[PDB]
Amino acid sequence: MDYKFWYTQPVPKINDEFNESVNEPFISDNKVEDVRKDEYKLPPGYSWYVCDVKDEKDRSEIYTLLTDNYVEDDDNIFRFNYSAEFLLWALTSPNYLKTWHIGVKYDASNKLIGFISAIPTDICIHKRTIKMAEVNFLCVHKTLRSKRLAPVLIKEITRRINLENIWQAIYTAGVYLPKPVSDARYYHRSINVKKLIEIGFSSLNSRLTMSRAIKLYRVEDTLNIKNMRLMKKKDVEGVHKLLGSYLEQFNLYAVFTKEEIAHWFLPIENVIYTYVNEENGKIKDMISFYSLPSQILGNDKYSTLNAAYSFYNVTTTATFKQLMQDAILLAKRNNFDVFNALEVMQNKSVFEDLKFGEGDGSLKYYLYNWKCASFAPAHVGIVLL
Numbered sequence: 001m002d003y004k005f006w007y008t009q010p011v012p013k014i015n016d017e018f019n020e021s022v023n024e025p026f027i028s029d030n031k032v033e034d035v036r037k038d039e040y041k042l043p044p045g046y047s048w049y050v051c052d053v054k055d056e057k058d059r060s061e062i063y064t065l066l067t068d069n070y071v072e073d074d075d076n077i078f079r080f081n082y083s084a085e086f087l088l089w090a091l092t093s094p095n096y097l098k099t100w101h102i103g104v105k106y107d108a109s110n111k112l113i114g115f116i117s118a119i120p121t122d123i124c125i126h127k128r129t130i131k132m133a134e135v136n137f138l139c140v141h142k143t144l145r146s147k148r149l150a151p152v153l154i155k156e157i158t159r160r161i162n163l164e165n166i167w168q169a170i171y172t173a174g175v176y177l178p179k180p181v182s183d184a185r186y187y188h189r190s191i192n193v194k195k196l197i198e199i200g201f202s203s204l205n206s207r208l209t210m211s212r213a214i215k216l217y218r219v220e221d222t223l224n225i226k227n228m229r230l231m232k233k234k235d236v237e238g239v240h241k242l243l244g245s246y247l248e249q250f251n252l253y254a255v256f257t258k259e260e261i262a263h264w265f266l267p268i269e270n271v272i273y274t275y276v277n278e279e280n281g282k283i284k285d286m287i288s289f290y291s292l293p294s295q296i297l298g299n300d301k302y303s304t305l306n307a308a309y310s311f312y313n314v315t316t317t318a319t320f321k322q323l324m325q326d327a328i329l330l331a332k333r334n335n336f337d338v339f340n341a342l343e344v345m346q347n348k349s350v351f352e353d354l355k356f357g358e359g360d361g362s363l364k365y366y367l368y369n370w371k372c373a374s375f376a377p378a379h380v381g382i383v384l385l
């Protein structure tokens, strides 16, 4: 890899290594007044488009572009299929900017062929809290790959973020770029074993017959934490306290306001699931996971893999293993086929006992214009959608 684009950016070179005493921008003393006011140039016949994610039709356009052209697994069997309602939630968090939801249309067809987005968040990296943009949903149509459109989308969003006097960003990708601050493998816990085998995701052998595989992943339909229930509006303060305190141990986490807790955690069917255990009107334990189905490509029987992805989980009245067991059960009660988690926070400690299998790859965490020491994923305390 030459990384001809990335090496022009304020990010580490492949060989850069910083000790814990270093925790600062690559480029400081930036000036809003100096930021370019002109949009980056696109190739002839393409135009910028400002997407209105609150408009059902504009939102449907983004949904279509992602459904057809977003992230596939390494074998091109599954493609992420974020729902339209999920994209509304993900992009309209507190203080979002409509001008950070950027499309590219092909003028002659009037169709969206590219997208990139950011939302603002306070990010604590090695105990320093910085206002950052969280970048997500970069996508170029399959038919226009390897034409250098992605650097155009990246430079244009950078410019729009810089106009708001924001100079750092956080992003994640499965691909290796200069240069990860942390790298987390993903693990999967089978729920609907038979389906996962039939679609090729899971395997049998002469020892592990179909019936034996089903038995292995069987779970008791009783919670360890009996009062675990869907989160309600009244629980916002308590979730804010519980989670906000928990996250301070990590090397990388978002500093959530109360308004951010209500947005990111209050339940929305088929989008975000949060459960809480209330004692004495105080929230003592919480479970959360989001819904990210994948379209199954080329399977006669099934079109969709329903997948729950571990989000934020905190226990003070049980063991972490007991809490994540309940999280798997609650995913099962909600019709999910598989429960997915990264080896961030305390997650790795429960993978063997709760019968997770190692996946085929990892998610890399990145910062833009920030130099600092890298760290094991157990010290990562943030999950991006």
Ligand SMILES: CCCCCCCCCCCCCC(=O)CSCCNC(=O)CCNC(=O)[C@H](O)C(C)(C)COP(=O)(O)OP(=O)(O)OC[C@H]1O[C@@H](n2cnc3c(N)ncnc32)[C@H](O)[C@@H]1OP(=O)(O)O
Binding pocket: 002, 003, 004, 005, 006, 007, 069, 070, 071, 072, 133, 135, 136, 137, 138, 139, 140, 141, 144, 145, 146, 147, 148, 149, 150, 151, 154, 157, 158, 161, 162, 166, 167, 168, 169, 170, 171, 172, 173, 174, 175, 177, 368, 369
């Ligand atoms: C202060 C504010 C700062 C704000 C900005 C922060 C940074 C935000 C950064 C964005 C974070 C988004 C996070 C996110 O959304 C979650 S990661 C998911 C990204 N989306 C997909 O994987 C969807 C399917 N793939 C595509 O749509 C295309 O393959 C994409 C658009 C990925 C690249 O289109 P393409 O047609 O395949 O490629 P060219 O146009 O020819 O471009 C080639 C250049 O793109 C570099 N590249 C490829 N994949 C990347 C990736 N995932 N991040 C960053 N850079 C990526 C690549 O290394 C090369 O640069 P190089 O020559 O130096 O190696």
Ligand SMILES: CN(C)Cc1n[nH]c2ccc(-c3ccc(F)cc3OCCn3ccnc3)cc12
Binding pocket: 071, 072, 073, 074, 136, 172, 173, 174, 186, 187, 309, 340, 341, 342, 361, 362, 363, 384, 385
């Ligand atoms: C994070 N958010 C930015 C979306 C995103 N983009 N890129 C990714 C690469 C992996 C995961 C992921 C995260 C947790 C997990 F349990 C399974 C995952 O992927 C399986 C499918 N796969 C394989 C290779 N590429 C995709 C998410 C993402």
Ligand SMILES: [Cl-]
Binding pocket: 155
């Ligand atoms: Cl340029």
Ligand SMILES: [Mg+2]
Binding pocket: 140, 144, 145, 146, 147, 148, 149, 150
């Ligand atoms: Mg391109």
